[PDB]
Design a protein around this motif. Structure first.
Motif, short mmCIF file in Angstrom:
data_model
loop_
_atom_site.label_atom_id
_atom_site.label_comp_id
_atom_site.label_asym_id
_atom_site.label_seq_id
_atom_site.Cartn_x
_atom_site.Cartn_y
_atom_site.Cartn_z
N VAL A 1 81.29 -15.16 -0.89
CA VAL A 1 80.47 -15.50 -1.33
C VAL A 1 81.17 -16.94 -2.02
O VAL A 1 79.30 -18.16 -2.43
N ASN B 1 80.91 -19.58 -0.05
CA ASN B 1 79.89 -20.15 1.09
C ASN B 1 78.60 -20.78 -0.08
O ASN B 1 78.71 -21.63 0.18
N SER B 2 79.18 -20.95 -1.34
CA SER B 2 78.41 -21.60 -2.55
C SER B 2 78.48 -22.82 -2.30
O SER B 2 78.21 -23.72 -3.23
N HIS C 1 77.72 -24.48 0.40
CA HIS C 1 76.52 -25.20 0.29
C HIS C 1 76.50 -26.29 -0.50
O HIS C 1 75.10 -26.92 0.04
N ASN C 2 76.45 -26.26 -1.94
CA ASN C 2 76.08 -26.77 -2.91
C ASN C 2 76.99 -28.29 -2.69
O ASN C 2 76.62 -29.65 -2.43
N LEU D 1 79.75 -3.76 5.67
CA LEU D 1 78.93 -4.55 6.30
C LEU D 1 78.50 -5.51 5.65
O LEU D 1 77.89 -6.97 5.94
N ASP D 2 78.43 -5.59 3.85
CA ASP D 2 78.10 -7.00 3.31
C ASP D 2 78.94 -7.83 3.19
O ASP D 2 78.59 -9.17 3.49
N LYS E 1 78.50 -10.37 6.75
CA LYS E 1 77.00 -10.90 6.61
C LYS E 1 77.58 -11.97 6.03
O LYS E 1 77.17 -12.99 5.92
N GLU F 1 77.18 -15.89 7.39
CA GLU F 1 76.10 -17.08 6.49
C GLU F 1 77.43 -17.72 6.12
O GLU F 1 76.72 -19.44 6.29
N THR G 1 76.65 -21.96 7.31
CA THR G 1 76.63 -22.98 6.59
C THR G 1 77.78 -23.38 6.99
O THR G 1 77.39 -25.63 6.69
N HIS H 1 75.29 -5.10 13.56
CA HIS H 1 74.09 -4.63 13.75
C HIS H 1 72.86 -6.28 13.46
O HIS H 1 73.13 -6.89 14.37
N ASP I 1 70.64 -7.38 12.01
CA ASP I 1 70.11 -8.48 10.68
C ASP I 1 71.64 -9.43 11.10
O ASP I 1 71.01 -10.91 12.26
N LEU J 1 70.98 -13.50 13.10
CA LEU J 1 71.72 -14.01 12.31
C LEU J 1 72.62 -14.61 13.84
O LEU J 1 72.51 -16.71 13.79
N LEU K 1 70.24 -17.18 15.95
CA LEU K 1 69.49 -18.54 15.72
C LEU K 1 70.56 -19.32 15.83
O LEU K 1 70.72 -20.16 15.40
N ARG L 1 70.94 -22.65 17.04
CA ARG L 1 70.72 -24.36 16.69
C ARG L 1 71.65 -24.63 17.41
O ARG L 1 72.27 -26.72 17.88
#
Lengths: 1132, 146
Positions: free
Chosen positions: A956, A959-960, A963-964, A1007-1008, A1011, A1015, A1019, A1044, A1046, A1050, A1053, A1057
């Motif tokens: 996480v 990923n943050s 993204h930033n 699964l978390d 995902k 993601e 990104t 899964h 979701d 993803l 998509l 892209r």
């Protein structure tokens, strides 16, 4: 009707020239607009018979009509028409052959059937064979080329025959035939099947061993230009041949240079640049006629090198390429222009998106000006224009380059400007270059040249040509600032230049029906002169200024006049504008009515600056008129205008508080309405607060502090959260304006304490106002605040609790020593309330002064560490955020401790510390940039192996960060790629299942992480695809297609892209990418299932169809059954 | 929902014994869930999501599973029927997005040129399309597109 066509046909063989031009025109008109078989045959026969006549007009009309004729006719008619045209084409009559060729070309152009094209191609193949006649061969080649240019999709099984029939034409003795067949082959290469290109390339390679025949090289260049992506795999066998053949004595390097340039432009991927760079360099140098165009080609060959490739900039700079380019500046014009263009392209490529390119370029700058010095003495206007453009480009790419060359370059500019033979373009270029140099150079290196730069500028001002006048005016305006810069001190007697510069400018002020651009330039120059040299002007300052009024009526120069007035008003010098104030201010008030955003802003700024600088000379008359246009300007529709209006009102109140009783009409109501505007944010809120503070300080009847409070919080006692924030902030600002408002706090406390007859809204507003007002002043003096705050913390609703917590946090900032310890011990005192108190602490670190917070850091850190390990997940999140926010201060003292905790910390402690640093990343630059960049290494690398929650939080955080701020993970992306790829794999140990009958349900504890990994991968596509490899990246996506729902969406998509990015890689594996997708689409809903599963599978199928449709933009793609055939129209 | 499905599977026999809110076991469970959602509890959950999405636009990583489940539960209720989803979260979410985007555009255009504004508009539109395709209903795709 039948009779109409019958009589038309009867009159068509009329034997009168004019009766056979009317019937044909009528037939053409009737056919153009939207006929029995016999009539069709008769008209076709008549047209064919008439195609050969003794007059050109009728022949041309019939040829034109042949086009539309085939547009509406059966196939047999077209077949027979083509057959007869081809047979006539073989006739010995030149006129008939030309007519047939033109008709066939028109028929081909009319067409977008297949049998006609096949027959035509067969006839051309048969006719093009070696024959004595050349005219028919040329006509057939032209027809084939036109057909290939028009249609290139059909005739897949005819390309080998066409290639075989065209190959013998290559060695034709006529160069025109060779060029035509080369063009035809180039056009046909696009149509082709794919197996023929290899055979053609092999044949050309084996035929390259020939005597002095340039046809093969021309054909190779043509095919490369027509298709470069299909020839990049055979460069190793072509480059050596041309390299070896370059040694020939005959002048034929032109073709080699041209093909090298074409390959460089089209085919970017190759590593043979240095092999031919030296060859080109030596070729450009030799000279001994037909030797100039070879030099031209050699010079132009480097254009692709300097333009396309950019990563190889330093090796160009270090090599002798720029040195030779600069040295070869004294040659004939044709090659000099191309050299100038090439170096201009190099300079343009230098500008980007040990030593940087800019530093290396400067070192060579002294070698350029000298090389151009002699070029300034040339009588050719082209050379002077090229030199001026080069100087302009060099100054633009990097300023401060031509600092020690002005003395040697100014004389050339003056000589060029004074030359009578100089054209308008040359003068314009010289003036533009001079303006660019002046605008990008220090004023300190131009004082000695004023005497040599003012006369020529003044002379250029008096020019009938308007563009030259505008350029001269711009140069004068620039020189006005350069000679007397107000930003820095100066010492130079410019008084002798005051008259002439004015004389050449004032004369241009009187437009008298002149170009708008000239008027605008003159107005701008006059305004700049007035602003800068306002004191020097004597009795000519007032009268000329009056002319500005005449410019405020017409709309042609309204914006320019307003800008000039605004610029004049704001300046260190004191300029008297009072004579034009009383007559000037009202006119400006008329510009606020017409809908013009730019004009409205300009006039508002002009009025504000005029009032600020000139406040002693004011009258209520014009002020009333100006105030009348404010009520319709302050609205939620536009925020920029509202801020300007608020600032104008504040300035008017500050420098003229007398006229404040008129705004009560509608301005106060509009402001009150805008206070509760949800969009109220940014500088507008600060401007409104400042205006309210100024109004409170001034003071007026009915506009007192009590009146303001009643008007603001009037409706609430008798809806958006931003409105509550705005009201609370306004109340706090008004209270601050008056340092003695003791009764207000006690009244608010009494109102808040009274639970009865007090709904949630009043309590919320009171709490917000107390929190806003308790920040900038100390409330420790008054007691009973903590008790009531704690009592209010316990309420049924959550909005009131959040507002109370925010108010407590804001108040704690006021008196840190008296409030911070109280909350610190209260947090540990009660366990059922700390969850709220902690939130209040979050405000302190984000609101309290760092210098004042220095003493109270160890206690907060200890409390956070003690509370870090808590059963409640929300409390853990709160403490993690608090630690992250506190980590901002004194990073040098905390970062080593955080690093140490990772050596022996527990899982929860590690998760908390990694979560804390996650929030430290911000989009804007921060002083912890290098520190965080160095620290995140071990955090991201060696902290994904042991645990599951640790892995999830690390992913996480990664990923943050991506993204930033993706720069932190830019140098270590590869070091973490293996771990990220491993985390994507599915684990069947972490999948539990419970079954209690026919139904089944699977629960996954991992699964978390998947995902989060997906993601992060998505990104990462922003600005990292150039580094991460593609083959190793899409394998995991292929594996994850079957995952899964979701994750399935993803990945779909992601594939959508990826359609526009690196399509070659996607196409190289489309088969295996879509095979799992086809398997999923071929799934059926489980029998006896709820509608939720049906809908879920339906959306999955629609997403899969959208993904495949995006990818398409033949592995059994035609699978449209009875039902699925009805789905696509719903997707598109 | 799992318990309701199991109970319906168990007592389908009784479910097929009447002659004719709704009497169906699954319908009864859905009605009970709708009633349990009607009370102010939803006002929290429906409100809470509004923060998460906002955080997603502030450079923070949020949990999409929770929002996906909430949206699925909302769309499934209302007995597809999207009445509750349309009158509960669709309007409020659309208004919040409009207000936030208007404020962001005003703030950007106040102190930035137009090229940067166009670039961030592309970025925001792509992010919105991603969000819609990830954790939102398909019927809303057009609604938030234009």
């Amino acid at each position: 009707a039948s009779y109409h066509i019958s009589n038309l046909l009867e009159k068509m063989t009329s034997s009168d020239k004019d009766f056979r031009f009317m019937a044909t025109n009528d037939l053409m008109t009737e056919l153009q607009k939207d006929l029995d078989d016999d009539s069709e045959r008769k008209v076709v026969k008549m047209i064919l018979k008439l195609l050969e006549d003794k007059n050109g007009e009728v022949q041309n009309l019939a040829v034109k009509c042949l086009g539309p004729l085939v547009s509406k006719v059966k196939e047999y008619q077209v077949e027979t028409i083509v057959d007869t045209l081809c047979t006539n084409m073989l006739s010995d009559k030149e006129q008939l052959r030309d007519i047939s060729s033109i008709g066939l070309k028109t028929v081909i152009g009319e067409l977008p059937a297949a049998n006609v094209c096949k027959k035509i191609t067969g006839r051309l193949t048969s006719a093009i064979a070696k024959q004595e006649d050349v005219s028919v061969q040329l006509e057939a080649l032209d027809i084939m080329a036109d057909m290939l240019s028009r249609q290139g999709g059909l005739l897949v099984n005819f390309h080998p025959s066409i290639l075989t029939c065209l190959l013998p034409q290559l060695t034709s003795p006529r160069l025109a035939v060779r060029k035509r067949t080369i063009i035809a082959l180039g056009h046909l290469v696009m149509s082709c099947f794919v197996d023929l290109i290899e055979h053609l390339l092999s044949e050309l390679s084996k035929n390259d061993s020939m005597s002095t025949t340039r046809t093969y090289i021309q054909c190779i260049a043509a095919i490369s230009r027509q298709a470069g992506h299909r020839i990049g795999e055979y460069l190793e066998k072509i480059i050596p041949l041309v390299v070896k053949f370059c040694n020939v004595d005959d002048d034929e390097l032109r073709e080699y240079c041209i093909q090298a340039f074409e390959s460089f432009v089209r085919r970017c991927p190759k590593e043979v640049y240095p092999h031919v760079s030296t060859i080109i360099n030596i070729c450009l140098k030799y000279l001994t006629d037909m030797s100039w165009k070879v030099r031209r080609a050699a010079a132009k060959c480097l254009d692709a090198v300097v333009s396309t490739r950019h990563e190889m900039l330093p090796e160009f700079y270090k090599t002798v390429s720029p040195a030779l380019i600069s040295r070869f500046k004294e040659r004939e014009e044709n090659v000099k222009a191309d050299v100038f263009h090439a170096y201009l392209s190099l300079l343009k490529q230098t500008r980007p998106v040990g030593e940087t390119p800019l530093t290396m370029l400067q070192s060579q700058v002294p070698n350029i000006v000298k090389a151009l010095h002699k070029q300034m003495k040339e009588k050719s206007v082209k050379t002077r224009q090229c030199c001026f453009n080069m100087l302009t480009e060099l100054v633009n790419v990097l300023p401060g380059a031509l600092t020690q060359h002005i003395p040697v370059l100014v004389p050339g500019i003056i000589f060029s400007l004074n030359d009578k033979s100089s054209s308008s373009n040359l003068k314009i270029d010289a003036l533009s270059c001079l303006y660019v140099i002046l605008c990008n150079h220090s004023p300190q290196v131009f004082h000695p040249h004023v005497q040599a730069l003012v006369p020529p500028v003044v002379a250029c001002v008096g020019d009938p040509f308007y563009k030259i006048t505008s350029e001269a005016l711009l140069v004068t305006q620039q020189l006005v600032k350069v000679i007397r810069p107000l930003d820095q001190p100066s010492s130079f007697d410019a008084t002798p230049y005051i008259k002439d510069l004015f004389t050449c400018t004032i004369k241009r002020l009187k437009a008298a029906d002149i170009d708008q651009e000239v008027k605008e330039r003159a107005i701008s120059c006059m305004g700049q002169i007035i602003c800068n040299l306002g004191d020097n002007l004597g009795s000519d300052l007032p009268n000329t200024l009056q002319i500005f009024l005449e410019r405020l009526k017409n709309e042609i120069t309204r914006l320019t006049t307003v800008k000039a007035l605004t610029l004049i008003a704001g300046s260190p010098l004191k300029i008297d504008l009072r004579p034009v104030l009383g007559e000037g201010v009202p006119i400006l008030a008329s510009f606020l009515r017409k809908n013009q955003r730019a004009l409205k802003l300009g006039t508002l700024s002009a009025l504000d600056i005029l009032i600020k600088n000139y406040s002693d000379s004011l009258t209520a008359a014009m002020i009333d008129a100006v105030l009348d246009e404010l009520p319709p300007l302050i609205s939620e529709s536009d925020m920029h205008v509202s801020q300007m209006a608020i600032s104008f009102l504040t300035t008017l109140a500050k420098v003229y508080p007398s006229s404040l009783s008129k705004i009560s009409g509608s301005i106060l109501n509009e402001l009150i309405g805008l206070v509760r505007s949800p969009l109220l944010q940014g500088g507008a809120l600060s401007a409104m607060l400042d205006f309210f503070q100024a109004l409170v300080v001034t003071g007026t009847n009915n506009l007192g502090y009590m009146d303001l409070l009643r008007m603001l919080t009037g409706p609430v006692y008798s809806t958006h959260k931003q409105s509550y924030y705005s009201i609370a902030k306004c109340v706090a600002a008004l209270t601050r304006a008056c340092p003695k408002e003791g009764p207000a706090v006690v009244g608010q406390f009494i109102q808040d304490v009274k639970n009865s007859r007090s709904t949630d809204s009043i309590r919320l507003l009171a709490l917000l106002s107390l929190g806003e007002v308790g920040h900038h002043i100390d409330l420790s003096g008054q007691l009973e605040l903590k008790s009531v705050i704690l009592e209010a913390f316990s309420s049924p609703s959550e909005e009131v609790k959040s507002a109370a917590s925010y108010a407590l946090g804001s108040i704690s900032v006021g008196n840190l020593p008296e409030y911070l310890p109280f909350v610190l011990q209260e947090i540990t005192s009660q366990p059922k309330r700390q969850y709220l108190l902690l939130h209040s602490l979050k405000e302190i670190i984000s609101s309290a002064s760092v210098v004042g917070l220095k003493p109270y850091v160890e206690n907060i850190w200890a409390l956070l560490l003690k509370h870090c390990e808590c059963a409640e997940e929300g409390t853990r999140n709160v403490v993690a955020e608090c630690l992250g926010k506190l980590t901002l201060i004194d990073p040098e003292t905390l970062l080593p401790r955080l690093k140490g905790y990772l050596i022996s910390g527990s899982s929860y402690a590690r998760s908390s510390v990694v979560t804390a640093v996650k929030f430290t990343i911000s989009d804007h630059p921060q002083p912890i940039d290098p520190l965080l960049k160095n620290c995140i290494g071990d955090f991201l690398k060696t902290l994904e192996d042991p645990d599951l929650n640790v892995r999830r939080v690390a992913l996480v955080t990664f990923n943050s960060a991506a993204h930033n701020k993706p720069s932190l993970i830019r140098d270590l992306l590869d070091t973490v790629l293996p771990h990220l790829y491993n985390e994507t794999k599915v684990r069947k140990e972490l999948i539990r299942e419970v079954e209690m009958g026919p139904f089944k349900h699977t629960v996954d504890d991992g699964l978390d992480i998947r995902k989060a990994a997906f993601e992060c991968m998505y990104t990462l596509l922003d600005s990292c695809l150039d580094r991460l490899d593609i083959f190793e990246f899409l394998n995991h996506v292929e594996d994850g297609l079957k995952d899964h729902y979701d994750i399935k969406m993803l990945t779909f998509l992601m594939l959508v892209r990826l359609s526009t990015l690196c399509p070659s890689a996607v196409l190289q594996r489309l088969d295996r990418l879509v095979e799992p997708l086809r398997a999923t689409c071929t799934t059926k809903v489980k029998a006896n299932s709820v509608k939720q599963e049906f809908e879920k599978q339906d959306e999955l199928k629609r997403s899969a169809m959208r993904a495949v449709a995006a990818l398409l933009t033949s592995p059994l793609m035609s699978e449209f059954q009875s039902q699925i055939s009805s789905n696509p129209e719903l997707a598109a | 929902r799992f318990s309701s499905k199991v109970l319906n599977g168990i007592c389908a026999y009784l479910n097929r014994h009447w002659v004719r809110g709704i009497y169906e076991i699954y319908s009864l469970a859905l009605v009970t869930w709708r009633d349990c959602l009607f009370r102010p509890l939803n006002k929290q959950v429906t409100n809470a999501v509004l923060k998460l999405i906002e955080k997603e636009r502030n450079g923070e990583t949020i949990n999409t599973r929770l929002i996906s489940g909430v949206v699925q539960s909302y769309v499934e209720l209302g007995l597809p029927t999207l009445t509750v989803y349309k009158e509960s979260f669709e309007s409020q979410f659309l208004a919040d997005t409009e207000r936030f985007y208007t404020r962001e555009s005003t703030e950007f255009l106040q102190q930035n040129p137009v090229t940067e504004y166009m670039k961030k508009a592309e970025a925001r539109l792509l992010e919105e399309q991603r969000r819609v395709q990830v954790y939102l209903h398909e019927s809303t795709q057009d609604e938030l597109a234009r």
